[PDB]
Structures are given as structure tokens and as C-alpha cells.
Design a protein around this ligand. Structure first.
Ligand SMILES: Nc1ccc(/N=N/c2ccc(S(N)(=O)=O)cc2)cc1
Ligand SMILES: Nc1ccc(/N=N/c2ccc(S(N)(=O)=O)cc2)cc1
Ligand SMILES: [Zn+2]
Length: 257
């Protein structure tokens, strides 16, 4: 029953998920002047050449593009990470207006949307075990600004009509997530959590400094999705983002000088 409305939104989540008020919750504001360059960080390696997309699903909170994670086909390594993290899915969070929609903020700036590429640590064997571990997941976060169109997003945009309502899925094979990345892999990193219930404190966040540009027409099509199921009253899928949470006893590290 959790969601993003007045009556089931982020201010209510703590009543069923008490970890909502925990010590390593996400997202956070990234204060760029306070974040410190870390020389101990190794080079970040995004290896998506053999990625195998399968399906796209409207789950009632966002849409997920799902991948075959039964082998090391699309992996994230290096940076703050020990070992190999396998891509399982990506999704977005976005706003009702271009001035909001991101989960992380940068010096309090909100972007129009945020892309999350979700990976699990292969030392734990599957996602279900990994999500219960403090180093179980790595989420690569990428900001979206409204400007020129992102060509590699268009195949996602054009399938959204077929998954308008909660519980609808469609085939989504042969999609290359490399087309969603910016040029630079400069990043900030900190230990955090899932940004939706169950809000588990199992995520190493890696947030790219360079946003990608998407067109107004592209984000407008995100906003035509529905939170509701088929034949229920229409509630547009907009503002599916959690606001920034207290940083508490954490340091945000930068990969770049
Ligand atoms: N209505 C309810 C509103 C809040 C939720 S919760 N605590 O957000 O999962 C559950 C039902
Ligand atoms: N049992 C269970 C149910 C739902 C789960 N959700 N996984 C999610 C995966 C990634 C995100 S996020 N927004 O990338 O932090 C948030 C949730 C995880 C485990
Ligand atoms: Zn997310």
C-alpha cells in the first residue's frame, strides 16, 4: 500500500518500515564543497557489452527494464567496490515539472529525473540474499536534465504506451544500456539504502557528476504512465521520488579533484 501520494507517501513510510529513520538512508543532498577527493578509489569499470535485456514492467511505482543476471554479462567493478556486481534492472524517478524529479540533489539542485542502474554483489549468489547485506548492492545513479534528446533512451520511450498501467509488461530484448551513460564517469560515492520500501541499508551509491540530456518530449512520455491498474481511476505516474534524507554520520567521497 505504500506510494507517493499525500496519504501513502514518504512521510508515512516509517510506520511500516521503521528503517526509514535509520542511520544510512538514501537519497541525500550532495554538498559538492564538502565532498572530498579520495585517492584510494580505484578506476570505475562499467562493462555492459554483453548485457541481455529481457522485459520492461510497470510495477505501480516506476518501470523496470530487467536483465538476464544468470551469468556475468553486464557488470560494475572498481571505484569503491570490492568484487563484481551484476546488473539486474534499471528504472527512473521523475517529476511532474522539469524543475523536480531527481532523488539525489547537488548543492540542493533537483534535476528533472534520475536513472538508477541496480547491481548485486555476486559473492551473495542472488539478488534476494544480496539485498539483505550491508555491501549487497551498488546503484549507479545518473541525473537527467531537459535539453537535447537522448537517442539511446528513445527505444524505452516508445514502448511505454504498451505498459501504461500497473502490472503490465512487454518484451524488451536487445536494448543496450550503454546508450544511457554520459561521457564522463566522474562520480560521488557514499553508503546508503534503497530509496523505496523496504528501504534496506544495503547500497553503495555511485552518483555520476555529469547529467545526461533528454528532450521535453521524452520526459513528457514518462509522465503519461499510470500508478493505477487497468480499469481503475487514472492517477498519472509523476513525482515518484523520495526527498533527501539526513546525512548523519557519513562522508561523501569524490572520484575527481
Ligand atoms: N494507507 C497507508 C498509508 C501508509 C502506508 S506505508 N506506512 O507508507 O506503508 C500503508 C497504508
Ligand atoms: N523483497 C524486496 C522487495 C522490493 C525490493 N526493491 N528493490 C529496489 C531496488 C532498487 C531501488 S533504488 N530506488 O534504486 O534504491 C529500490 C528498491 C527489494 C526486495
Ligand atoms: Zn531508484
Amino acid at each position: 500500500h505504500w506510494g507517493y501520494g499525500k496519504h501513502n507517501g514518504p512521510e508515512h513510510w516509517h510506520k511500516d518500515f521503521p528503517i526509514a529513520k535509520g542511520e544510512r538512508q538514501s537519497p541525500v543532498d550532495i554538498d559538492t564543497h564538502t565532498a572530498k577527493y579520495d585517492p584510494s578509489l580505484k578506476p570505475l569499470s562499467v562493462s555492459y557489452d554483453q548485457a541481455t535485456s529481457l522485459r520492461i514492467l510497470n510495477n505501480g511505482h516506476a518501470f523496470n527494464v530487467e536483465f538476464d543476471d544468470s551469468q556475468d554479462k553486464a557488470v560494475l567493478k572498481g571505484g569503491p567496490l570490492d568484487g563484481t556486481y551484476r546488473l539486474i534492472q534499471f528504472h527512473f524517478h521523475w517529476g511532474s515539472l522539469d524543475g523536480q524529479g531527481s532523488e539525489h540533489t547537488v548543492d540542493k539542485k533537483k534535476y528533472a529525473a534520475e536513472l538508477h542502474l541496480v547491481h548485486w554483489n555476486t559473492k551473495y549468489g542472488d539478488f534476494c540474499k544480496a539485498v539483505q547485506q550491508p555491501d549487497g548492492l551498488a546503484v549507479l545513479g545518473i541525473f537527467l536534465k531537459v535539453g537535447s534528446a537522448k537517442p539511446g533512451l528513445q527505444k524505452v520511450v516508445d514502448v511505454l504506451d504498451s505498459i501504461k498501467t500497473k502490472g503490465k509488461s512487454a518484451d524488451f530484448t536487445n536494448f543496450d544500456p550503454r546508450g544511457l551513460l554520459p561521457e564522463s564517469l566522474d562520480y560521488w560515492t557514499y553508503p546508503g539504502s534503497l530509496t523505496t520500501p523496504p528501504l534496506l541499508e544495503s547500497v553503495t551509491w555511485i552518483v555520476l557528476k555529469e547529467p545526461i540530456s533528454v528532450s521535453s518530449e521524452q520526459v513528457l512520455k514518462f509522465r503519461k504512465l499510470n500508478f493505477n491498474g487497468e480499469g481503475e481511476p487514472e492517477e498519472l505516474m509523476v513525482d515518484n521520488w523520495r526527498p533527501a534524507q539526513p546525512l548523519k554520520n557519513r562522508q561523501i567521497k569524490a572520484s575527481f579533484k
